[PDB]
Amino acid sequence: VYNDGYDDDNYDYIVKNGEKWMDRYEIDSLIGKGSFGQVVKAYDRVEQEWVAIKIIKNKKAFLNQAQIEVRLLELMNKHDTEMKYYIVHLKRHFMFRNHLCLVFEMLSYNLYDLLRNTNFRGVSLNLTRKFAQQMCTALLFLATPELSIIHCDLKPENILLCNPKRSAIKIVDFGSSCQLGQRIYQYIQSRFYRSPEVLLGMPYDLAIDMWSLGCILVEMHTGEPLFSGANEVDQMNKIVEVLGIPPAHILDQAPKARKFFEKLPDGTWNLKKTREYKPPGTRKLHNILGVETGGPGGRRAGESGHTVADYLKFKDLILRMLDYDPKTRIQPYYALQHSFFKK
Ligand SMILES: c1ccc(CNc2nc(Nc3cc(C4CC4)n[nH]3)c3sccc3n2)cc1
Numbered sequence: 001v002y003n004d005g006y007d008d009d010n011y012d013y014i015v016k017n018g019e020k021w022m023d024r025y026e027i028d029s030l031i032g033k034g035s036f037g038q039v040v041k042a043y044d045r046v047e048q049e050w051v052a053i054k055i056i057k058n059k060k061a062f063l064n065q066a067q068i069e070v071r072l073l074e075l076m077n078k079h080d081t082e083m084k085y086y087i088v089h090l091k092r093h094f095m096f097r098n099h100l101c102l103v104f105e106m107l108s109y110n111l112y113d114l115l116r117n118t119n120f121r122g123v124s125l126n127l128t129r130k131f132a133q134q135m136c137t138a139l140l141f142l143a144t145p146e147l148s149i150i151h152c153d154l155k156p157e158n159i160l161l162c163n164p165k166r167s168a169i170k171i172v173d174f175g176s177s178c179q180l181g182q183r184i185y186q187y188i189q190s191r192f193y194r195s196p197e198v199l200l201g202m203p204y205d206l207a208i209d210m211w212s213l214g215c216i217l218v219e220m221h222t223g224e225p226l227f228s229g230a231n232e233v234d235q236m237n238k239i240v241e242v243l244g245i246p247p248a249h250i251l252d253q254a255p256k257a258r259k260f261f262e263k264l265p266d267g268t269w270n271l272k273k274t275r276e277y278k279p280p281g282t283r284k285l286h287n288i289l290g291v292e293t294g295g296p297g298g299r300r301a302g303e304s305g306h307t308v309a310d311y312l313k314f315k316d317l318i319l320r321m322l323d324y325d326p327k328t329r330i331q332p333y334y335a336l337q338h339s340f341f342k343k
Contacts, residue, residue, distance in 0.1 A: 003058055006097045011057040012037055013099050021096050025053065036062060036175055037099070041106060049106075051091065056100040066100050069175050072149060073102070076141075076174070085141040086134045088160060088172040107170065109163060111156035111216070115223055122223035125295065125314060126305045127167065131220060132317075133341055134169050135159075135213050140332035143206050148180035150204070154212035155190040156219065180205055191235055192225045196246060197326050199236050200254035207326035210335070214321030221314075222288065222296040236260045237277045242288075244281030245269050246324045285322075291315055313340040 008014055015038060019027045025042040032039025037057040044051045056066040073090035083089055091103045111131075115122060122128075142149040151158075153176040162168040176188070184203045189195060193212035197204050218226040226242070229235025237260075240246075251257045251269045261269045271280070286292070291311040294301025317340045320330035330338075 003098055007058055011059040011062070013055045013058070013097070015040060015055075021101075022094075025051070027053075034175075036066060044103070047091075052104045052106045054102040054104065056102070058098045063100055066102070066175075069177070070100075070102065072174050072177055072179070075147060076149070079144060079147060080141065086138040086168070086170045087141065088170045104172075107160040107162060107172075109161045110172075111159040111161070111169065111220065114161060115156065115220075118223055120223035121299065122219075122221050122296070124303070124305070125221055125300065125310060128217060128221045128314075129305070129340065130167050131159075131169050132213075132217050133336070135171070135216070136332045136335045138171050139206070139209055139213065140336060142209070143332055148206065149174070150178050150180065150206055151209050151212075152176045152178060152188045153190060154209055154216060155193050156216065157190075159216070191232070192228050194232075194235060195326070196236070196239060196250075196324055199232055199239075199256065199260075200246075200250070201256040202250075202254055205326065207329045207331075210321050210329055210332065214318050217314075217318060217321070218285075218288065226288070233260060234275065237271070240271060240280050241278045241283040242281070242285060243322060243324060245271070250324055285315055285319060289315055289318075310340075313338070316340070 002009065006014055015027065015030045017027060017029055021027070024046050025044055028041040028043065030038060031041045031052065036054065038055045040053045040055065042051055042053050056062050070090070070093055076087055077089060080087070080089070088104055088107070091105065093100060093102050095101070141147070142151065151171060151174065153173060154171070158171065158173045160170050160172050162170065186201055187198075189198055189208060189212060193215050195204060195208035195211040198208060215226045227235060227238040229238050245261070246269070248267075248269060251261055257269075260272065262272050264270055288296065289311055290296045290298055292308060295306055295311065300306035317330070317335065317338050321335070323329040
């Protein structure tokens with residue numbers, strides 16, 4: 001027996017469908033499993049609503065890590081207040097049979113689910129524009145100095161949709177998140193969405209999230225991840241195909257520079273001859289987007305909001321979000337003033 005019979009050998013709560021916790025939560029099913037522990041779908045009898053409960057493992061390590069998450073979730077709750085910034089907010093937390101329990105809103109679809117509903121051909125630049133304004137709004141919120149939060153894991157899997165309030169998304173999972181300055185790491189973000197500064201072992205700040213958003217916006221409208229590397233070297237080759245050799249002022253300061261590039265005798269940087277690759281900067285965004293050919297594989301030809309001028313506005317935005325230099329990558333405030341959003 002562990003935790004009086006309520007826990008398994010591995011510090012996790014033994015989930016039984018139908019259990020009433022404190023005459024308030026009727027548990028329906030396990031819906032989630034992670035290093036942190038378990039997520040459950042439950043009916044909150046008092047608020048007459050479905051909720052998702054994150055049961056943290058019964059272990060000092062995981063409890064204090066989850067208590068870091070609770071700090072950020074609640075700081076994100078002091079600000080905001082009217083739940084209007086596309087963040088899946090913490091409704092509350094309680095201790096039940098020696099497990100920390102975070103209660104969240106239940107949402108049953110992520111961005112992925114919406115791209116399988118398109119057989120991965122993607123969505124109108126009109127819908128992309130809507131989500132983009134939602135995501136950018138969220139990153140603007142996260143960049144409030146008091147917050148200065150880095151999500152560190154933006155990906156379609158972590159972007160949930162409000163079916164009820166159709167054409168609305170929310171960012172989820174702040175368990176991998178950290179605050180500006182907290183202390184640099186080295187292997188963060190989902191590979192496909194991983195910033196060049198992180199690939200290069202350099203320091204990072206809120207801009208890594210804007211990078212990940214650039215790659216998600218393209219993947220929303222093409223149906224296809226922009227940069228699907230099978231390891232870090234392939235990932236950085238796939239980036240260079242599109243954006244060229246990173247500038248010198250960046251590579252000259254990058255610990256992992258030589259894991260991908262080689263400094264020639266004249267001081268100029270180049271790639272390394274070990275799957276061969278387009279030469280640098282020749283898989284153009286202008287073409288992937290189909291800017292002059294009615295969108296990716298010219299599918300939205302004619303359709304309102306898919307004019308050349310629309311795509312010149314979109315490409316300019318993406319390319320500003322995919323800047324190699326995190327000092328000059330577009331920040332969410334100027335990103336919201338972009339013409340791609342304007343009348
Ligand atoms: C385990 C389970 C869930 C997560 C967050 N990912 C997630 N959450 C969902 N639902 C969910 C989570 C939440 C908050 C508990 C975090 N509300 N609703 C859904 S519905 C379809 C895919 C999907 N992916 C992370 C680990």
